[PDB]
């Protein structure tokens, strides 16, 4: 199937004393593989998956060098933005940045992206074409004009279409036994009596990867959303994911209801029905 590499960066200013907190995380698909935390002892980019541990010292030295450069960019950006928005030195503010690349089923470049936010709102982002910028306000508009004249999009596009994809393909191969494996959801249904006359059926999907999944309830072969509840997909902590969907039904009518599970790891969607 298709694959992505993404890096996420967060910097939070700390007015009372010292420098911003900076946290960077790298993912392949839904697997974290690297991290940097300004509060941690190593002051290095660190491995978070076994398949990245084989990279040699040149790699770790380079990633550490780059990630520190990102940290210092975010530190000056916080100051630039405080000035652009006429804010005082007293309050904490946040920058967030995400970038990376998607490949399709055949490993060719599909999409790239680079987005930046201030205080949890859009600031500036590269357009899908990787050629121009979407600026949310007049501060970001001044950023856009500067970055246009300096050819910032062009240099980012070359990374996103080129070296980003190349590294993604390298990681997919090195990590193949997990990164190129789908884990289909392990599914079951529970039943609970809610009153004398009603019951709750809950359809569980467990231990799946990747995270993307769809759970839907049908009654008499038609989709039902009334009297349902669907929890957001949550990490199990072992690299897989979990989700459930529940429906309240008249006691005795459980057989009319079916839970439908769609996932990349299933050749065909599953249908579950209450059978005890």
């Amino acid at each position: 199937g298709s694959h992505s590499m993404r890096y996420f960066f967060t910097s939070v200013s700390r007015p009372g004393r010292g420098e911003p907190r900076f946290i960077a995380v790298g993912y392949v698909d839904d697997t974290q593989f690297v991290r940097f935390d300004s509060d941690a002892a190593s002051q290095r980019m660190e491995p978070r998956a076994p398949w990245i541990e084989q990279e040699g010292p040149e790699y770790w030295d380079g990633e550490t060098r780059k990630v520190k450069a990102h940290s210092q960019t975010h530190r000056v950006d916080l100051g630039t933005l405080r000035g652009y928005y006429n804010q005082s030195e007293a309050g904490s503010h946040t920058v967030q940045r995400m970038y990376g690349c998607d490949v399709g089923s055949d490993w060719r470049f599909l999409r790239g992206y680079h987005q930046y936010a201030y205080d949890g709102k859009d600031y500036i982002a590269l357009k899908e074409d990787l050629r121009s910028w979407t600026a949310a306000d007049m501060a970001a508009q001044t950023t856009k004009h500067k970055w246009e004249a300096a050819h910032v999009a062009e240099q980012l596009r070359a990374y996103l279409e080129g070296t980003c994809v190349e590294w993604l393909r390298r990681y997919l191969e090195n990590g193949k036994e997990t990164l190129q494996r789908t884990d289909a959801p392990k599914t079951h249904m529970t039943h609970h009596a809610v009153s004398d006359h009603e019951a709750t059926l809950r359809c569980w999907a467990l231990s799946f990867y990747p995270a993307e999944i769809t759970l839907t309830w049908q009654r008499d072969g038609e989709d039902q959303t009334q009297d349902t509840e669907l929890v957001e997909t949550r990490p199990a902590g072992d690299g897989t994911f979990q989700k459930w969907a529940a429906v309240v039904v008249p006691s005795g009518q459980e057989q009319r209801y079916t839970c439908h599970v769609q996932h990349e790891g299933l050749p065909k969607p599953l249908t579950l029905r209450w059978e005890p």
Binding site: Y7, G26, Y59, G62, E63, K66, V67, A69, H70, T73, V76, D77, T80, L81, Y99, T143, K146, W147, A150, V152, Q155, L156, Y159, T163, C164, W167
Partner: peptide, 9 residues
């Protein structure tokens, strides 16, 4: 691998 030439605001 990280991008090598991030631009500041």
């Amino acid at each position: 691998s990280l991008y090598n030439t991030i631009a500041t605001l």
